[PDB]
Amino acid sequence: TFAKIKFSAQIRLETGLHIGGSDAFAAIGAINSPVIKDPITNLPIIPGSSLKGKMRTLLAKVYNEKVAEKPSDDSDILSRLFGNSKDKRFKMGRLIFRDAFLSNADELDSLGVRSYTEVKFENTIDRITAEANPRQIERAIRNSTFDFELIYEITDENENQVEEDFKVIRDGLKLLELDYLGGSGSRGYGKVAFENLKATTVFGNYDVKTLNELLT
């Protein structure tokens, strides 16, 4: 068979997220580090490169039994899952991390929210001379959702990695429920929460009855 499987999920923000964007020289008093927004709707967009590369750099610590000097040196548990540039059979690596374009806006404007991107203020104080240095950085608002989805494709090339990859990706989702996923994380941004990890086999003879009993 050929089994493409779609992982419907709800990225709900808490401690609202900022992904970087155009640090091309913006206006004077305006936002210094603006968020990347989808140019049709101007809602915040969490692109798939942040998700895939962040889950790459976080599953580095989990499933690379050896220390990895670079993402080419990922093991053959992650090279088949996130792609690899120098491996023989692990190019085109089976996971299309689709984006999310701020799914709810009829809900988030039903709550009395002016704009979906707050402009939180920040500065820095040097320890010597204590000079201030202010900045206005853009973030998405707190209780947003994000209709995020994966595409895992099973081409009968594996035939044994049915659940050898979902214990990896589900615990990566747990990592992202703990770690920040995007932007100035160590100041406490991002903090996505993954809700309703709904897998559905959009192509293939396959059941989720052995899948969502682990993915909860």
Partner 1 sequence: TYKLYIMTFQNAHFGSGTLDSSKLTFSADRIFSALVLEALKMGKLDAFLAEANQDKFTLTDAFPFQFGPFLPKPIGYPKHQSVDVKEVRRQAKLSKKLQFLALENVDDYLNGELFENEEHAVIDTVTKNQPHKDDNLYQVATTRFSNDTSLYVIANESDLLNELMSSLQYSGLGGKRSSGFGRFELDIQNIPLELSDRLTKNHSDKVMSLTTALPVDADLEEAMEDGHYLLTKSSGFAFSHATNENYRKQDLYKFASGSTFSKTFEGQIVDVRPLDFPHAVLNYAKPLFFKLEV
Partner 2 sequence: KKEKIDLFYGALLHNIGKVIQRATGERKKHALVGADWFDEIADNQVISDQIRYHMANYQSDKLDHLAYITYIADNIASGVDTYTNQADIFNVFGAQTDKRYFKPTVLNLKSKPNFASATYEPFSKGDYAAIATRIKNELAEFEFNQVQIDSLLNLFEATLSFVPSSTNTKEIADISLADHSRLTAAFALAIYDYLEDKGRHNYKEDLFTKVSAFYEEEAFLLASFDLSGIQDFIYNINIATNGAAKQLKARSLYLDFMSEYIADSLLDKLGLNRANMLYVGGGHAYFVLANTEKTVETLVQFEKDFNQFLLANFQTRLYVAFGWGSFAAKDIMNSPESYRQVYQKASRMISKKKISRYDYQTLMLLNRGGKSSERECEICHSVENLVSYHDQKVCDICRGLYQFSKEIAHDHFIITENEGLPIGPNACLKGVAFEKLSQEAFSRVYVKNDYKAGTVKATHVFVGDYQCDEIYNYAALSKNENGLGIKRLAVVRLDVDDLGAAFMAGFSQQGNGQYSTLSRSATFSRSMSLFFKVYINQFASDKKLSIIYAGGDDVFAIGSWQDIIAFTVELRENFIKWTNGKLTLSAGIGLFADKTPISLMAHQTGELEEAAKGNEKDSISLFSSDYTFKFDRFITNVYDDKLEQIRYFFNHQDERGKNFIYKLIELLRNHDRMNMARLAYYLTRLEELTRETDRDKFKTFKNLFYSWYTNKNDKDRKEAELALLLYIYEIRK
Give the interface with partner 1 as residue ranges (CB under 8 A): 2, 4, 6, 21-22, 36, 38-40, 47-49, 51-53, 57, 82-83, 85-89, 91-93, 95-99, 151, 153, 155-156, 202-203
Helix (H) or strand (E) holding 203: strand 192-203
Name the packing angle between helices 166-178 and 48-63 (round to 10°): 110
Judged by beta carbon distances under 5 to 8 A according to partner kind, the member of partner 1, partner 2, its own copies, none in contact with residue 185 is its own copies
3-class SS of residue 144: coil
Close Cβ partners of 216 (under 8 Å, ≥ 6 residues apart) = 197
Widest CA span in the chain = 68
The tokens for 155 are 């081409």
Fill in the per-residue mask, 42 to 71: x = in contact with its own copies (CB under 8 A), - = not in contact.
Answer: -----xxx-xxx---x--xxx----xxxxx
Q: How many chain residues bind partner 2 (CB under 8 A)?
A: 9
Q: Which two tokens stand for residue 139?
A: 């973030």
Q: Which of 2, 14, 30, 167 binds partner 2 (CB under 8 A)?
A: 30
CB of 55 to partner 1, least distance (A): 12
Cα–chain center distance at 16: 14
> Gaps in the chain (C–N > 2.5 Å) come after which residues?
none
93 scored as a contact of its own copies (CB under 8 A): yes
Q: Binding residue for its own copies (CB under 8 A) from 127, 131, 133, 160?
A: 127
Q: Which part of the chain contacts its own copies (CB under 8 A), choosing from 21-29, 159-167, 192-200, 208-216?
A: 21-29
To the nearest whole angstrom, how small is the minimum distance from the Cβ of residue 213 to its own copies? 22
Task: Return the C-alpha torsion angle 113, 115, 116, 119, nearest 10.
Answer: -120
Interface ranges with partner 2 (CB under 8 A): 22-30
